Design a protein around this ligand. Sequence first.
Ligand SMILES: Cc1cc(C(F)(F)F)nc(Nc2ccccc2-c2nnn[nH]2)n1
Ligand SMILES: Cc1cc(C(F)(F)F)nc(Nc2ccccc2-c2nnn[nH]2)n1
Length: 284
Amino acid sequence: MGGVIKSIFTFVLIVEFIIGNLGNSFIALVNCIDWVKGRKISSVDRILTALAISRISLVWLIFGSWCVSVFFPALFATEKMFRMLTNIWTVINHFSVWLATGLGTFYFLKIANFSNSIFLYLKWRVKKVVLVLLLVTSVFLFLNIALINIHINASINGYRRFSSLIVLTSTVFIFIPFTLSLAMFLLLIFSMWKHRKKMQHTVKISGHRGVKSVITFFLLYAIFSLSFFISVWTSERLEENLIILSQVMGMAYPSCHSCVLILGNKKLRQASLSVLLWLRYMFK
Ligand SMILES: Cc1cc(C(F)(F)F)nc(Nc2ccccc2-c2nnn[nH]2)n1
Ligand SMILES: Cc1cc(C(F)(F)F)nc(Nc2ccccc2-c2nnn[nH]2)n1
């Protein structure tokens, strides 16, 4: 039963790798092309391309880790790699997750409207707010690095793997930005619903159009949240082949969330449709 599970996990990891690579590469390439040929890019475009760069870095790191675990695994068994690779992974993943959270904050501030003066101040200071949020969050990165390093050092000292708790720490420190992003998304949905309710009563229908793209983000949130809920249960519930399971699980968000951005964004959606129609045309 182990062999079939391992093969299925490897295949799903391979498809995740290729899909994430192609999606993030498409995002970065279209943004760079539009930058080169005039087309003054927007702040959202800059954030999207930076996120794509971070995600391609993360997927390359994870795929290299998998290759090292497959080819000459003796190197992977070394403690030095166990420490260095996880440190670089946590740094890159923290930066990527908080960049995504910054994109969400930019959306929430730019689009949503409220009567609370604090919200108005953050709304009109949005550009400095997101940059400070990215800079101030570095304290979380340093604390995560210190905690993971001390935990692995203690585990090694006791030994002279114990990933059930390192993965727990990673999940705990990944839920922190995710909860804020979910709360902000719910707040924006509430704002849009209230705006449309108020618009449908006084103003006639002839006069919150983003609900069309809200459906896909809800699906992504649900799927990723279910996978993460399964993660904590599986970390202690059963089995011990967590290396491949964790290696595939940690690559879902940067591999699939990018496609959601592609469909949710008008520019990326138009680029995807143009690519599809160009593929059709060249076929002749
Ligand atoms: C591909 C790879 C290899 C390694 C390792 F080489 F360091 F093992 N780590 C990780 N990062 C994780 C990401 C998500 C969940 C868990 C870990 C995790 N497992 N063990 N340590 N961190 N991803
Ligand atoms: C591209 C796009 C469009 C829409 C729309 F449906 F409102 F138009 N919504 C989102 N999502 C968010 C919305 C608010 C706050 C944060 C996120 C978020 N968090 N993580 N990723 N995006 N994104």
